[PDB]
Each structure stands twice: as C-alpha cells, then as structure tokens.
C-alpha cells in the first residue's frame, strides 16, 4: 500500500533523509543503505525546546537494498512548528541533519475519477481529489497530454476541470493528473492518476 508511496521518493538520492506526512498528523523518515551489513545508528529529534526524544529504527529488505526508517508520534506532528531530526552512526559521525515543517512534506494519493469527453468548443477533462485526504479545497493539480509528444498544463488551487481546446485531429491522446498541497502548505507531487484515452475528431 504505502510501500509504493515511499518508492516514489527514494530516487531523491541518498544525501537527504526522505520524510513525508500522509495527513499532517503523522510522519515517517527513511534512507536506503544497500546491504552488501546492518550496522547500528541512532535517530534523535527535537520538537522546539522540549527534551530530545529518540525514535526506534526498523530494518527491512526491499530488493537488494536495505531500508532503515522510523515513525513519529501524532502529538509531536500535529503542529506547524519546526522539528529537528538527526541520524547518527554509533561512532558519533553524523549521517543526516535536517529541519522540517511537517506541513511542508505532505505526499498525497493519486487523484481518481478522470474523465475525457468532447465539448462547440473542439475537449473537457474532469477528475476527483485524492480520496481519504482532507483539505481538498487547496490541492494543486497538473495534467499531462501525450500523442511522440508530451505537454503539462498546471491547474491551481481547487480546480477539477480542464478546458483544452488547442488540439490535433485524427491522433490518439493520453491524459493523467497528479496532485500536491499548495502558500501555507507544501509537499511532493503525487503519483499520476490512471490515464484516460481519446481519439480526436476530423
């Protein structure tokens, strides 16, 4: 389920601790350290000037890389207050050092409900917000039109409709939309929706 949400991010590279929240009242951080030998590490965080807490790490194969992660508690995560994080080798040498506003690292589901249908305009796209995610009145979407060719139309706060009228005829077209949080919010592009296809007119 969530295994493929994290799978998106891991191609952000090993030099940064990849963290994200699913609904702004939770948080998960991981890094990939291909096995070729576990070792030992420490995960510390500080919330404001509260005494530093320790998150218990967990280990799991991925295939043949190893994924070390941990999960924060809801009382720490539910505030838009900076939160420090730290991963330290047992020798003391620091691996990662990071400050996040949890509201800035939200990763959404893919939007569902994508429909394509001709308009006297010459096509109209509609789709639904990512399910089981609140604050839908603030999502940022993006469509992708492909024929080979690709084009991305940016759609801003709370719109679930596209009015593309500048097309070709007698060509196959493919459409997909992604979603992310938007000026008191931020995060990462969701995976793409399931695509929809439409054979254009003459």
């Amino acid at each position, epitope marked *: 389920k969530f295994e493929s949400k994290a799978a998106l991010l891991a191609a952000r590279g090993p030099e940064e601790l990849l963290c994200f929240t699913e609904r702004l009242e939770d948080l998960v951080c991981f890094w990939e350290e291909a096995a070729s030998g576990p070792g030992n590490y*420490s995960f*510390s965080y*500080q919330l404001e000037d509260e*005494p530093w807490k*320790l998150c218990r790490l967990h280990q799991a194969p991925t295939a043949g890389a190893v994924r070390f992660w941990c999960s924060l508690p809801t009382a720490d995560t539910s505030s838009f207050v900076p939160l420090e994080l730290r991963v*330290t080798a047992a020798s003391g040498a620091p691996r990662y050092h*990071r*400050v996040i506003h949890i509201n800035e690292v939200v990763l959404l589901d893919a939007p569902v409900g994508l429909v394509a249908r001709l308009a006297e305009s010459g096509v109209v796209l509609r789709w639904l917000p990512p399910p089981e995610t609140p604050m839908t009145s603030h999502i940022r979407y993006e469509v992708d039109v492909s024929a080979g060719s690709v084009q991305r139309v940016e759609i801003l706060e709370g719109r679930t409709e596209c009015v593309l009228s500048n097309l070709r005829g007698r060509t196959r077209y493919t459409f997909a939309v992604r979603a992310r949080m938007a000026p008191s919010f931020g995060g990462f592009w969701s995976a793409w929706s399931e695509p929809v296809s439409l054979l254009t007119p003459s």
Partner: antibody, heavy 117, light 108 residues
Framework: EVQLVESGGGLVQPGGSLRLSCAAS????????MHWVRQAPGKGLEWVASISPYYSYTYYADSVKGRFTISADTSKNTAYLQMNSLRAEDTAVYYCARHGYGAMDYWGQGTLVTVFN | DIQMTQSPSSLSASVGDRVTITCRASQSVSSAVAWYQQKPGKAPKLLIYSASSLYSGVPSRFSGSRSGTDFTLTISSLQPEDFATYYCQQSSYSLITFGQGTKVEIKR
C-alpha cells in the same frame, strides 16, 4: 526557572590548564545538546564544542581539537570544558548554551579566561 | 568548511527606520540559521530560528527571510532598544559558524 551558571575562569599562563563548569537547573542536562561558545574581547562569537544527549558524542571546532574536552556529569546536572595547552589567543569570555528551536535558546552569563604572559 | 559572510558590518539609522541585515552562506547548507541580538556586557539573545520563525516573546518588527544562499534579517521600525550587534548562525552536521557581526548605530 531555566538557568545556566558558569564558573572556573581566571588567569592562566601559556600552556597551563583550566576547567570550566556549567551548572544547569530547571531542565535535565542529559536530554539536551550543550554548546560552549567563546568571545574574544572586542570580537565576535566562535563556536567551541558540543555534546549530544544520552550518547555524549563530542564535536569540537578545528581550533580547539586535542586540547579541549567537553564532558558532562548527569548526577550533578553539570557540563564541563577542560582546556589544556592554553594559548594567548584563547583569551575570551566563555559561554555555555542549551540547544532549542534549532539554535541556542538559553545562555549562561559567561566566565572570562585570561591567558597572560 | 562553511563560511558566513555578514554584511554590512555596521550601519547608522534613525529611530523608526527600516533596516535589513544580510548573511551569505559560502555554500550549500541547511536552513538551520538563527539570529541573535547582543548588547554590551550581555549574552546573545535568540531572536529568529529556522531562518524565519519569531522566537517566543520577540516583537513583530523582527522578520526573517531567505532567498537562495542569502539569509536576511529585517527590523521594520527601529526602536531605541534595537540598537545593538546582530549575528547570524548556521549549523550543518557538527560545525556551527557565525557571521562576523553587524553593529546598528543611531543616526543623530
């Protein structure tokens, strides 16, 4: 309530040694990062060393490596900075601060180390 | 290493003026950057943290912003108590470095 209180500065010849103390009340020192920062008279701020929570990992500025040692004693809720092989350029007012909000939120009043010839 | 080049090293403004101090990270480093005010004979006092967040009790005329590698602190309407020296601080993994300081003096 929260308070840091330093002691131990003074006058020392070149090459001699001094041990500074940082007594902390109103929070448990074990659960925090602690730093020593020094200020030469008429000059700016220079970080000196840090110590970590629960593991007491120590990190030093390149200038004081080998000669200075940061340490803590949890039973007395005090941090120490033992300075060895003191040079004239070590002369400064020495602060200890407490990690918080991603910076140092609580600083002591500072103690003056004078290396004299 | 990390360098922090603070500019200007001094400025003169009148009471009620808008002032901006700027701090340039020599390089690629985390936005764990804070601002301290220091007055003669006293320890530094934390003003801003996480490059933009006001420390509890600090007046609203203080503001933090970033753009690329440039971190700026702005005081929107100078009051007599604000004339002091200001430092920026950056923390990286273990090294902590400070700007060379900026002294704010009164125009008379």
């Amino acid at each position: 309530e929260v308070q840091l209180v330093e002691s131990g500065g003074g006058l020392v010849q070149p090459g001699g040694s001094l041990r500074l103390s940082c007594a902390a009340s109103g929070f448990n020192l074990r659960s925090y990062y602690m730093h020593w920062v020094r200020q030469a008279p008429g000059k700016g701020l220079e970080w000196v060393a840090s110590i970590s929570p629960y593991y007491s990992y120590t990190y030093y500025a390149d200038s004081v490596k080998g000669r200075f040692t940061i340490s803590a004693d949890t039973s007395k809720n005090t941090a120490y900075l033992q300075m060895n092989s003191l040079r004239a350029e070590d002369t400064a007012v020495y602060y200890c601060a407490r990690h918080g909000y991603g910076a140092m939120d609580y600083w002591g009043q500072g103690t003056l180390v004078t290396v004299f010839n | 290493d990390i360098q922090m080049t603070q500019s200007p090293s001094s400025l003169s403004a009148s009471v009620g003026d808008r002032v901006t101090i700027t701090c340039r990270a020599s390089q690629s480093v985390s936005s764990a950057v804070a601002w301290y005010q220091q007055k003669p004979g006293k320890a530094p006092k934390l003003l801003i943290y996480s490059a933009s967040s006001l420390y509890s009790g600090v007046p609203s005329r203080f503001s933090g912003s970033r753009s690329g590698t440039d971190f700026t602190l702005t005081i929107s309407s100078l009051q007599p108590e604000d004339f002091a020296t200001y430092y920026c601080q950056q923390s990286s993994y273990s090294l902590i470095t400070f700007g060379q300081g900026t002294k704010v003096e009164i125009k008379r």
